[PDB]
Amino acid sequence: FLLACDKGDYYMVKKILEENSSGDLNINCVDVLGRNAVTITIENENLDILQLLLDYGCQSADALLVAIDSE
């Protein structure tokens, strides 16, 4: 769940996620301003990534609200 999420390079994030396999990178980590994986990606509308990113691992509680807010 590295900065790739932003770049929206699905493969990269996908790889990193798999490569992470409970690795250093905290999928549920926050950026400089708090954005979690789902969040930083909700805003940039990478629904593709979010398709399963949210299926598991990625923390997301206020995401619905994030989504609604981001319409």
Side-chain angles (χ1 to χ4, degrees), residues 47-50 52-55 57-66:
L47 300 189
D48 170 36
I49 302 183
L50 294 158
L52 300 181
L53 166 63
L54 312 190
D55 191 12
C58 180
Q59 158 58 19
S60 58
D62 292 6
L64 180 52
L65 305 175
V66 177

Side-chain angles (χ1 to χ4, degrees), residues 27-34 36-39:
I27 294 184
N28 308 355
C29 186
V30 302
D31 63 344
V32 179
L33 295 81
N36 193 8
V38 51
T39 300

Side-chain angles (χ1 to χ4, degrees), residues 15-29:
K15 181 209 61 57
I16 292 178
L17 196 165
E18 172 62 19
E19 161 273 340
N20 280 353
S21 181
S22 179
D24 51 346
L25 273 46
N26 177 14
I27 294 184
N28 308 355
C29 186

